[PDB]
Amino acid sequence: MKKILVISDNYQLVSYIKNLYLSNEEWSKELFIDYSYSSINRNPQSLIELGMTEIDIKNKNLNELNDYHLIISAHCKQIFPAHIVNNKLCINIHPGLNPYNRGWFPQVFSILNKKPIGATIHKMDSGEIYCQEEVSILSHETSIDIYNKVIELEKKLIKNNLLKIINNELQPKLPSGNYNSIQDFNKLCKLNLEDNGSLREHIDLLRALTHGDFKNAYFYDENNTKVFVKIELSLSQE
Amino acid sequence: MKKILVISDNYQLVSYIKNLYLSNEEWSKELFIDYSYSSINRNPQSLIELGMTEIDIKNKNLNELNDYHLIISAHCKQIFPAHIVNNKLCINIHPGLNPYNRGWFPQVFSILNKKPIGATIHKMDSEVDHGEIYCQEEVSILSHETSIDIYNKVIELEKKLIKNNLLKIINNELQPKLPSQEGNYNSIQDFNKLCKLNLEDNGSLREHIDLLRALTHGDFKNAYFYDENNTKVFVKIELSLSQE
Ligand SMILES: [Cl-]
Protein backbone atom coordinates (compact mmCIF):
# COMPACT_ATOMS: atom_id res chain seq x y z
CA MET A 1 0.00 0.00 0.00
CA LYS A 2 1.15 3.55 -0.86
CA LYS A 3 0.11 6.91 0.51
CA ILE A 4 -0.46 9.54 -2.17
CA LEU A 5 -1.05 13.32 -2.09
CA VAL A 6 -3.04 15.16 -4.80
CA ILE A 7 -2.69 18.93 -4.74
CA SER A 8 -5.32 20.47 -7.02
CA ASP A 9 -7.44 23.59 -7.35
CA ASN A 10 -9.54 22.01 -10.15
CA TYR A 11 -12.94 20.61 -9.16
CA GLN A 12 -13.30 18.47 -12.24
CA LEU A 13 -9.97 16.66 -12.08
CA VAL A 14 -10.24 16.11 -8.30
CA SER A 15 -13.77 14.78 -8.60
CA TYR A 16 -12.61 12.51 -11.35
CA ILE A 17 -9.78 11.02 -9.39
CA LYS A 18 -12.04 10.55 -6.42
CA ASN A 19 -14.61 8.81 -8.61
CA LEU A 20 -11.96 6.49 -10.05
CA TYR A 21 -10.80 5.55 -6.58
CA LEU A 22 -14.41 4.81 -5.59
CA SER A 23 -15.21 2.74 -8.66
CA ASN A 24 -11.96 0.89 -9.05
CA GLU A 25 -11.01 -1.74 -6.52
CA GLU A 26 -7.41 -1.67 -7.74
CA TRP A 27 -7.12 1.92 -6.42
CA SER A 28 -8.95 1.29 -3.12
CA LYS A 29 -6.82 -1.76 -2.23
CA GLU A 30 -3.49 -0.17 -3.04
CA LEU A 31 -3.91 3.52 -2.03
CA PHE A 32 -4.63 6.04 0.71
CA ILE A 33 -5.06 9.41 -1.03
CA ASP A 34 -5.07 12.74 0.69
CA TYR A 35 -6.40 15.67 -1.34
CA SER A 36 -5.59 19.36 -0.72
CA TYR A 37 -6.30 22.63 -2.48
CA SER A 38 -3.92 25.61 -2.40
CA SER A 39 -3.84 28.18 0.39
CA ILE A 40 -3.90 30.81 -2.36
CA ASN A 41 -7.25 29.59 -3.72
CA ARG A 42 -9.66 32.52 -3.29
CA ASN A 43 -12.78 30.38 -3.77
CA PRO A 44 -12.20 26.82 -2.39
CA GLN A 45 -15.74 26.29 -1.12
CA SER A 46 -16.58 23.65 -3.71
CA LEU A 47 -13.33 21.78 -3.05
CA ILE A 48 -14.14 21.86 0.64
CA GLU A 49 -17.51 20.42 -0.17
CA LEU A 50 -15.87 17.79 -2.30
CA GLY A 51 -13.63 16.57 0.54
CA MET A 52 -10.25 18.39 0.67
CA THR A 53 -7.92 20.18 3.15
CA GLU A 54 -5.92 23.35 2.61
CA ILE A 55 -2.17 23.04 1.90
CA ASP A 56 0.44 25.68 1.37
CA ILE A 57 3.02 23.99 -0.82
CA LYS A 58 5.42 26.94 -0.88
CA ASN A 59 5.83 26.77 2.91
CA LYS A 60 5.09 23.09 3.61
CA ASN A 61 7.99 21.43 5.30
CA LEU A 62 9.47 18.39 3.65
CA ASN A 63 9.44 16.77 7.03
CA GLU A 64 5.64 16.48 6.94
CA LEU A 65 5.72 14.88 3.48
CA ASN A 66 7.76 11.75 4.25
CA ASP A 67 4.83 9.27 4.09
CA TYR A 68 3.96 10.15 0.47
CA HIS A 69 5.13 7.86 -2.27
CA LEU A 70 4.57 10.76 -4.65
CA ILE A 71 2.64 13.97 -4.98
CA ILE A 72 0.34 14.75 -7.89
CA SER A 73 -0.20 18.32 -9.10
CA ALA A 74 -3.41 18.77 -11.09
CA HIS A 75 -3.73 22.51 -11.77
CA CYS A 76 -2.36 23.53 -8.34
CA LYS A 77 -2.47 27.30 -8.39
CA GLN A 78 0.89 27.59 -6.53
CA ILE A 79 4.16 26.68 -8.09
CA PHE A 80 5.93 23.88 -6.20
CA PRO A 81 9.29 25.04 -4.86
CA ALA A 82 12.42 23.53 -6.30
CA HIS A 83 13.13 21.80 -3.01
CA ILE A 84 9.78 19.94 -3.14
CA VAL A 85 10.27 18.67 -6.66
CA ASN A 86 13.87 17.65 -6.09
CA ASN A 87 13.08 15.73 -2.88
CA LYS A 88 9.70 14.14 -3.64
CA LEU A 89 8.55 12.45 -6.80
CA CYS A 90 6.15 15.05 -8.17
CA ILE A 91 3.95 14.44 -11.16
CA ASN A 92 2.05 17.24 -12.99
CA ILE A 93 -1.19 16.86 -14.94
CA HIS A 94 -0.77 19.70 -17.42
CA PRO A 95 -3.34 21.18 -19.79
CA GLY A 96 -0.95 21.66 -22.73
CA LEU A 97 1.15 19.53 -25.09
CA ASN A 98 4.68 19.88 -23.85
CA PRO A 99 6.91 21.28 -25.02
CA TYR A 100 4.66 23.70 -26.95
CA ASN A 101 3.18 26.76 -25.30
CA ARG A 102 4.43 25.83 -21.93
CA GLY A 103 3.46 28.28 -19.24
CA TRP A 104 0.23 30.19 -19.01
CA PHE A 105 -3.01 29.26 -20.77
CA PRO A 106 -1.58 26.96 -23.48
CA GLN A 107 -4.82 26.88 -25.48
CA VAL A 108 -4.97 30.67 -25.77
CA PHE A 109 -1.51 30.72 -27.25
CA SER A 110 -2.09 27.76 -29.57
CA ILE A 111 -5.15 29.45 -31.06
CA LEU A 112 -2.87 32.35 -32.06
CA ASN A 113 0.39 30.59 -32.96
CA LYS A 114 -0.95 27.25 -34.28
CA LYS A 115 1.43 25.16 -32.23
CA PRO A 116 -0.02 21.86 -30.93
CA ILE A 117 -2.31 21.75 -27.96
CA GLY A 118 -3.18 18.80 -25.83
CA ALA A 119 -2.58 17.39 -22.37
CA THR A 120 0.57 15.97 -20.80
CA ILE A 121 1.31 14.04 -17.58
CA HIS A 122 5.01 14.64 -16.76
CA LYS A 123 7.57 14.57 -13.95
CA MET A 124 8.27 17.95 -12.34
CA ASP A 125 11.94 19.12 -12.27
CA SER A 126 13.61 22.57 -12.22
CA GLY A 127 10.38 17.32 -17.04
CA GLU A 128 10.08 13.84 -18.50
CA ILE A 129 6.73 12.95 -20.13
CA TYR A 130 4.87 9.79 -19.15
CA CYS A 131 2.00 10.23 -21.62
CA GLN A 132 0.43 12.97 -23.65
CA GLU A 133 -2.01 13.45 -26.49
CA GLU A 134 -3.04 16.23 -28.90
CA VAL A 135 -6.51 17.77 -29.36
CA SER A 136 -7.63 19.68 -32.46
CA ILE A 137 -8.62 23.39 -32.64
CA LEU A 138 -11.64 23.88 -34.89
CA SER A 139 -12.56 27.09 -36.66
CA HIS A 140 -15.54 27.92 -34.43
CA GLU A 141 -13.82 27.24 -31.13
CA THR A 142 -12.77 29.58 -28.41
CA SER A 143 -10.36 29.26 -25.52
CA ILE A 144 -13.04 27.80 -23.27
CA ASP A 145 -14.00 25.17 -25.92
CA ILE A 146 -10.36 24.02 -26.31
CA TYR A 147 -9.81 24.04 -22.54
CA ASN A 148 -12.86 21.86 -22.13
CA LYS A 149 -11.44 19.35 -24.64
CA VAL A 150 -8.19 19.51 -22.70
CA ILE A 151 -9.84 18.72 -19.41
CA GLU A 152 -11.65 15.82 -21.11
CA LEU A 153 -8.31 14.53 -22.39
CA GLU A 154 -6.69 14.90 -18.93
CA LYS A 155 -9.40 12.62 -17.49
CA LYS A 156 -8.66 10.08 -20.21
CA LEU A 157 -4.94 10.26 -19.47
CA ILE A 158 -5.56 9.86 -15.78
CA LYS A 159 -7.98 6.95 -16.26
CA ASN A 160 -5.60 5.02 -18.56
CA ASN A 161 -2.19 5.90 -17.08
CA LEU A 162 -2.18 7.30 -13.56
CA LEU A 163 -2.32 4.05 -11.56
CA LYS A 164 0.45 2.67 -13.73
CA ILE A 165 2.53 5.75 -13.18
CA ILE A 166 1.92 5.42 -9.46
CA ASN A 167 2.95 1.72 -9.56
CA ASN A 168 6.11 2.43 -11.56
CA GLU A 169 4.78 0.52 -14.56
CA LEU A 170 5.24 3.38 -17.06
CA GLN A 171 8.58 5.11 -17.62
CA PRO A 172 8.83 8.70 -18.82
CA LYS A 173 10.94 10.25 -21.64
CA LEU A 174 12.56 13.70 -22.14
CA PRO A 175 10.74 16.07 -24.48
CA SER A 176 11.99 16.38 -28.03
CA GLY A 177 10.14 24.32 -26.92
CA ASN A 178 8.39 27.64 -26.04
CA TYR A 179 7.02 29.35 -23.02
CA ASN A 180 4.38 32.10 -22.60
CA SER A 181 4.20 34.47 -19.65
CA ILE A 182 1.27 36.01 -17.82
CA GLN A 183 2.56 39.36 -19.10
CA ASP A 184 2.31 37.95 -22.62
CA PHE A 185 -1.30 37.06 -21.77
CA ASN A 186 -1.92 40.59 -20.44
CA LYS A 187 -0.41 42.22 -23.45
CA LEU A 188 -2.85 40.30 -25.58
CA CYS A 189 -5.82 41.48 -23.48
CA LYS A 190 -5.05 45.16 -24.13
CA LEU A 191 -6.45 45.53 -27.60
CA ASN A 192 -5.14 48.20 -29.90
CA LEU A 193 -7.95 49.53 -32.08
CA GLU A 194 -5.35 50.84 -34.56
CA ASP A 195 -3.74 47.40 -35.14
CA ASN A 196 -3.69 46.59 -38.86
CA GLY A 197 -4.24 42.91 -39.68
CA SER A 198 -6.49 40.42 -41.42
CA LEU A 199 -10.00 39.81 -40.11
CA ARG A 200 -8.79 36.26 -39.56
CA GLU A 201 -6.00 37.50 -37.21
CA HIS A 202 -8.38 39.72 -35.32
CA ILE A 203 -11.11 37.04 -34.98
CA ASP A 204 -8.48 34.61 -33.73
CA LEU A 205 -7.33 37.09 -31.09
CA LEU A 206 -10.92 37.60 -29.88
CA ARG A 207 -11.50 33.86 -29.83
CA ALA A 208 -8.25 33.19 -27.94
CA LEU A 209 -9.36 35.75 -25.36
CA THR A 210 -12.93 34.46 -25.03
CA HIS A 211 -13.35 32.14 -21.98
CA GLY A 212 -16.76 32.01 -20.39
CA ASP A 213 -18.58 34.90 -18.75
CA PHE A 214 -15.42 36.58 -17.49
CA LYS A 215 -14.21 38.91 -20.31
CA ASN A 216 -10.46 39.53 -20.83
CA ALA A 217 -10.06 41.46 -24.05
CA TYR A 218 -10.59 45.21 -23.66
CA PHE A 219 -10.04 48.49 -25.38
CA TYR A 220 -10.19 52.03 -24.21
CA ASP A 221 -12.54 54.25 -26.27
CA GLU A 222 -12.34 57.93 -27.24
CA ASN A 223 -13.40 58.94 -23.72
CA ASN A 224 -11.10 56.48 -21.95
CA THR A 225 -13.98 54.23 -21.08
CA LYS A 226 -12.94 50.58 -20.70
CA VAL A 227 -14.86 48.21 -22.95
CA PHE A 228 -14.55 44.45 -22.71
CA VAL A 229 -14.99 42.35 -25.83
CA LYS A 230 -15.71 38.73 -26.53
CA ILE A 231 -16.77 36.79 -29.59
CA GLU A 232 -19.23 34.05 -30.24
CA LEU A 233 -18.88 31.56 -33.07
CA SER A 234 -21.38 28.86 -34.02
CA LEU A 235 -22.21 26.31 -36.66
CA SER A 236 -25.87 27.26 -36.17
CA GLN A 237 -27.34 30.69 -36.94
CA GLU A 238 -29.92 30.37 -34.14
CA MET B 1 -63.76 62.57 -37.23
CA LYS B 2 -61.24 60.84 -39.49
CA LYS B 3 -60.61 57.26 -40.47
CA ILE B 4 -56.93 56.13 -40.40
CA LEU B 5 -55.15 53.04 -41.71
CA VAL B 6 -52.03 51.81 -39.96
CA ILE B 7 -50.03 49.23 -41.84
CA SER B 8 -47.27 47.74 -39.80
CA ASP B 9 -45.33 44.60 -39.13
CA ASN B 10 -43.82 45.86 -35.91
CA TYR B 11 -45.54 44.85 -32.69
CA GLN B 12 -43.93 47.50 -30.54
CA LEU B 13 -45.04 50.38 -32.78
CA VAL B 14 -48.60 49.07 -33.34
CA SER B 15 -49.01 48.31 -29.60
CA TYR B 16 -47.77 51.82 -28.85
CA ILE B 17 -50.23 53.47 -31.15
CA LYS B 18 -53.07 51.35 -29.70
CA ASN B 19 -52.05 52.38 -26.21
CA LEU B 20 -52.00 56.07 -27.00
CA TYR B 21 -55.44 55.78 -28.55
CA LEU B 22 -56.68 54.02 -25.43
CA SER B 23 -55.11 56.61 -23.12
CA ASN B 24 -55.70 59.92 -24.91
CA GLU B 25 -59.25 61.19 -25.30
CA GLU B 26 -58.08 63.48 -28.10
CA TRP B 27 -57.31 60.40 -30.19
CA SER B 28 -60.48 58.42 -29.41
CA LYS B 29 -62.73 61.40 -29.97
CA GLU B 30 -61.24 62.29 -33.40
CA LEU B 31 -60.18 58.97 -34.97
CA PHE B 32 -61.30 55.55 -36.17
CA ILE B 33 -58.14 53.51 -36.69
CA ASP B 34 -57.84 50.29 -38.70
CA TYR B 35 -54.64 48.26 -38.24
CA SER B 36 -53.24 45.75 -40.74
CA TYR B 37 -50.09 43.66 -41.13
CA SER B 38 -48.49 42.68 -44.43
CA SER B 39 -49.63 39.55 -46.30
CA ILE B 40 -45.92 38.73 -46.77
CA ASN B 41 -45.37 38.50 -43.01
CA ARG B 42 -44.31 34.91 -42.39
CA ASN B 43 -45.04 35.11 -38.68
CA PRO B 44 -47.94 37.51 -37.95
CA GLN B 45 -49.18 35.59 -34.95
CA SER B 46 -48.38 38.23 -32.30
CA LEU B 47 -49.89 40.87 -34.54
CA ILE B 48 -53.08 38.82 -34.88
CA GLU B 49 -53.14 38.59 -31.12
CA LEU B 50 -52.86 42.38 -31.02
CA GLY B 51 -55.97 43.01 -33.12
CA MET B 52 -54.96 43.40 -36.80
CA THR B 53 -56.08 42.11 -40.24
CA GLU B 54 -53.90 41.11 -43.19
CA ILE B 55 -53.45 43.62 -46.06
CA ASP B 56 -51.61 43.29 -49.36
CA ILE B 57 -50.75 46.89 -50.14
CA LYS B 58 -48.98 45.83 -53.34
CA ASN B 59 -52.28 44.61 -54.79
CA LYS B 60 -54.77 46.54 -52.78
CA ASN B 61 -57.06 48.47 -55.04
CA LEU B 62 -57.19 52.21 -54.58
CA ASN B 63 -60.96 52.15 -54.55
CA GLU B 64 -61.05 50.13 -51.40
CA LEU B 65 -59.09 52.95 -49.61
CA ASN B 66 -61.28 56.00 -50.20
CA ASP B 67 -62.50 56.28 -46.56
CA TYR B 68 -59.00 56.83 -45.19
CA HIS B 69 -57.85 60.35 -44.60
CA LEU B 70 -54.31 59.01 -44.51
CA ILE B 71 -52.33 55.77 -44.25
CA ILE B 72 -49.46 55.29 -41.81
CA SER B 73 -46.64 52.86 -42.59
CA ALA B 74 -44.75 51.67 -39.55
CA HIS B 75 -42.04 49.18 -40.60
CA CYS B 76 -44.34 47.61 -43.17
CA LYS B 77 -42.35 44.76 -44.77
CA GLN B 78 -43.98 45.39 -48.20
CA ILE B 79 -43.02 48.47 -50.15
CA PHE B 80 -45.97 50.74 -51.00
CA PRO B 81 -46.47 50.98 -54.76
CA ALA B 82 -46.08 54.47 -56.30
CA HIS B 83 -49.79 54.67 -57.15
CA ILE B 84 -50.74 54.31 -53.52
CA VAL B 85 -48.34 57.01 -52.26
CA ASN B 86 -49.15 59.38 -55.09
CA ASN B 87 -52.91 59.09 -54.59
CA LYS B 88 -53.27 58.74 -50.81
CA LEU B 89 -51.49 60.72 -48.09
CA CYS B 90 -49.08 58.15 -46.69
CA ILE B 91 -46.85 58.79 -43.75
CA ASN B 92 -43.83 56.64 -42.88
CA ILE B 93 -42.41 56.03 -39.44
CA HIS B 94 -38.81 55.29 -40.31
CA PRO B 95 -36.05 53.94 -38.09
CA GLY B 96 -33.28 56.05 -39.69
CA LEU B 97 -32.35 59.76 -39.79
CA ASN B 98 -33.34 60.67 -43.34
CA PRO B 99 -31.70 61.27 -45.75
CA TYR B 100 -28.80 59.29 -44.29
CA ASN B 101 -28.79 55.51 -44.76
CA ARG B 102 -32.24 55.41 -46.25
CA GLY B 103 -33.55 51.90 -46.93
CA TRP B 104 -32.74 48.79 -44.97
CA PHE B 105 -31.27 48.55 -41.46
CA PRO B 106 -30.13 52.18 -41.11
CA GLN B 107 -28.31 51.55 -37.81
CA VAL B 108 -26.14 48.78 -39.33
CA PHE B 109 -24.93 51.13 -42.00
CA SER B 110 -24.45 53.99 -39.58
CA ILE B 111 -22.21 51.90 -37.32
CA LEU B 112 -20.04 51.25 -40.44
CA ASN B 113 -20.09 54.58 -42.29
CA LYS B 114 -20.64 56.96 -39.33
CA LYS B 115 -23.54 58.87 -40.97
CA PRO B 116 -26.23 60.09 -38.54
CA ILE B 117 -28.74 57.60 -37.12
CA GLY B 118 -32.11 58.37 -35.55
CA ALA B 119 -35.77 58.31 -36.42
CA THR B 120 -37.90 60.15 -38.94
CA ILE B 121 -41.60 60.62 -39.68
CA HIS B 122 -41.95 61.71 -43.28
CA LYS B 123 -44.41 61.87 -46.16
CA MET B 124 -43.94 58.97 -48.60
CA ASP B 125 -43.22 59.85 -52.19
CA SER B 126 -42.46 57.31 -54.92
CA GLU B 127 -38.82 56.96 -53.76
CA VAL B 128 -37.85 54.94 -50.66
CA ASP B 129 -37.51 57.02 -47.45
CA HIS B 130 -37.36 60.14 -49.48
CA GLY B 131 -40.42 62.44 -48.92
CA GLU B 132 -40.86 65.62 -46.88
CA ILE B 133 -39.95 65.27 -43.17
CA TYR B 134 -42.47 66.20 -40.40
CA CYS B 135 -40.08 65.52 -37.52
CA GLN B 136 -36.98 63.51 -36.72
CA GLU B 137 -34.34 63.21 -34.07
CA GLU B 138 -30.80 61.88 -33.84
CA VAL B 139 -29.57 59.18 -31.47
CA SER B 140 -25.90 58.48 -30.59
CA ILE B 141 -23.84 55.31 -31.18
CA LEU B 142 -21.64 54.55 -28.14
CA SER B 143 -18.52 52.45 -28.25
CA HIS B 144 -20.04 49.28 -26.66
CA GLU B 145 -23.25 49.23 -28.74
CA THR B 146 -24.37 46.75 -31.39
CA SER B 147 -27.07 46.96 -34.06
CA ILE B 148 -29.67 45.78 -31.62
CA ASP B 149 -28.73 48.40 -28.99
CA ILE B 150 -29.04 51.28 -31.51
CA TYR B 151 -32.26 49.74 -32.98
CA ASN B 152 -33.87 49.71 -29.51
CA LYS B 153 -32.86 53.37 -28.98
CA VAL B 154 -34.37 54.13 -32.43
CA ILE B 155 -37.60 52.36 -31.56
CA GLU B 156 -37.79 54.33 -28.28
CA LEU B 157 -37.36 57.53 -30.26
CA GLU B 158 -40.05 56.57 -32.82
CA LYS B 159 -42.42 56.17 -29.89
CA LYS B 160 -41.57 59.64 -28.62
CA LEU B 161 -42.02 61.14 -32.09
CA ILE B 162 -45.41 59.52 -32.54
CA LYS B 163 -46.40 60.56 -29.01
CA ASN B 164 -45.40 64.16 -29.62
CA ASN B 165 -46.33 64.63 -33.27
CA LEU B 166 -48.53 62.03 -34.86
CA LEU B 167 -51.88 63.59 -33.96
CA LYS B 168 -50.59 66.92 -35.16
CA ILE B 169 -49.55 65.40 -38.43
CA ILE B 170 -52.96 63.73 -38.81
CA ASN B 171 -54.64 67.04 -37.93
CA ASN B 172 -52.55 69.00 -40.52
CA GLU B 173 -50.90 71.03 -37.77
CA LEU B 174 -47.27 70.14 -38.60
CA GLN B 175 -45.93 70.89 -42.09
CA PRO B 176 -42.96 68.92 -43.43
CA LYS B 177 -39.68 70.12 -44.91
CA LEU B 178 -37.54 68.79 -47.75
CA PRO B 179 -34.71 66.49 -46.81
CA SER B 180 -31.36 68.32 -46.77
CA GLN B 181 -29.92 66.16 -49.58
CA GLU B 182 -30.76 63.17 -51.79
CA GLY B 183 -28.73 61.06 -49.33
CA ASN B 184 -27.95 57.35 -49.76
CA TYR B 185 -30.02 54.16 -49.80
CA ASN B 186 -28.89 50.67 -48.70
CA SER B 187 -30.45 47.54 -50.12
CA ILE B 188 -30.96 44.08 -48.71
CA GLN B 189 -28.23 42.93 -51.09
CA ASP B 190 -25.83 45.51 -49.64
CA PHE B 191 -26.55 44.01 -46.17
CA ASN B 192 -26.03 40.46 -47.41
CA LYS B 193 -22.67 41.37 -48.92
CA LEU B 194 -21.61 42.71 -45.55
CA CYS B 195 -22.65 39.45 -43.88
CA LYS B 196 -20.25 37.46 -46.02
CA LEU B 197 -17.02 38.08 -44.14
CA ASN B 198 -13.75 38.13 -45.96
CA LEU B 199 -11.18 36.61 -43.61
CA GLU B 200 -8.31 38.12 -45.70
CA ASP B 201 -9.75 41.61 -45.43
CA ASN B 202 -6.98 43.94 -44.22
CA GLY B 203 -8.11 46.60 -41.77
CA SER B 204 -7.79 48.11 -38.34
CA LEU B 205 -9.13 46.20 -35.39
CA ARG B 206 -11.57 49.11 -35.04
CA GLU B 207 -12.98 48.49 -38.56
CA HIS B 208 -13.27 44.78 -37.82
CA ILE B 209 -15.01 45.35 -34.51
CA ASP B 210 -17.34 47.86 -36.08
CA LEU B 211 -18.23 45.38 -38.80
CA LEU B 212 -18.95 42.68 -36.21
CA ARG B 213 -20.97 44.93 -33.96
CA ALA B 214 -23.01 46.29 -36.97
CA LEU B 215 -23.85 42.68 -37.78
CA THR B 216 -24.69 41.61 -34.23
CA HIS B 217 -28.46 41.78 -33.56
CA GLY B 218 -29.79 39.35 -30.96
CA ASP B 219 -29.65 35.56 -31.09
CA PHE B 220 -30.07 35.40 -34.91
CA LYS B 221 -26.51 35.66 -36.33
CA ASN B 222 -25.84 37.47 -39.65
CA ALA B 223 -22.06 37.53 -40.17
CA TYR B 224 -20.38 34.39 -41.37
CA PHE B 225 -17.25 33.01 -42.90
CA TYR B 226 -16.34 29.75 -44.50
CA ASP B 227 -13.43 27.86 -42.99
CA GLU B 228 -10.76 25.52 -44.54
CA ASN B 229 -13.28 22.74 -45.06
CA ASN B 230 -16.04 25.03 -46.34
CA THR B 231 -17.99 24.90 -43.14
CA LYS B 232 -20.08 27.97 -42.46
CA VAL B 233 -19.37 29.68 -39.15
CA PHE B 234 -21.50 32.49 -37.83
CA VAL B 235 -19.98 35.24 -35.80
CA LYS B 236 -21.25 37.73 -33.30
CA ILE B 237 -19.53 40.03 -30.82
CA GLU B 238 -20.34 41.17 -27.30
CA LEU B 239 -19.09 44.49 -25.95
CA SER B 240 -19.66 45.62 -22.36
CA LEU B 241 -18.79 48.22 -19.81
CA SER B 242 -18.61 45.46 -17.15
CA GLN B 243 -16.29 42.39 -17.07
CA GLU B 244 -19.00 39.96 -15.99
CL1 LIG C 1 -29.22 67.57 -52.98
UniProtKB/TrEMBL annotation, chain A:
<dbReference type="Pfam" id="PF00551">
    <property type="entry name" value="Formyl_trans_N"/>
</dbReference>
<feature type="domain" description="N-formyltransferase dimerization C-terminal">
    <location>
        <begin position="184"/>
        <end position="234"/>
    </location>
</feature>
<dbReference type="InterPro" id="IPR036477">
    <property type="entry name" value="Formyl_transf_N_sf"/>
</dbReference>
<dbReference type="InterPro" id="IPR040660">
    <property type="entry name" value="N_formyltrans_C"/>
</dbReference>
<dbReference type="InterPro" id="IPR002376">
    <property type="entry name" value="Formyl_transf_N"/>
</dbReference>
<feature type="domain" description="Formyl transferase N-terminal">
    <location>
        <begin position="63"/>
        <end position="159"/>
    </location>
</feature>
<dbReference type="GO" id="GO:0004479">
    <property type="term" value="F:methionyl-tRNA formyltransferase activity"/>
</dbReference>
<protein>
    <submittedName>
        <fullName>VioF</fullName>
    </submittedName>
</protein>
<dbReference type="Pfam" id="PF18216">
    <property type="entry name" value="N_formyltrans_C"/>
</dbReference>
<dbReference type="GO" id="GO:0005829">
    <property type="term" value="C:cytosol"/>
</dbReference>
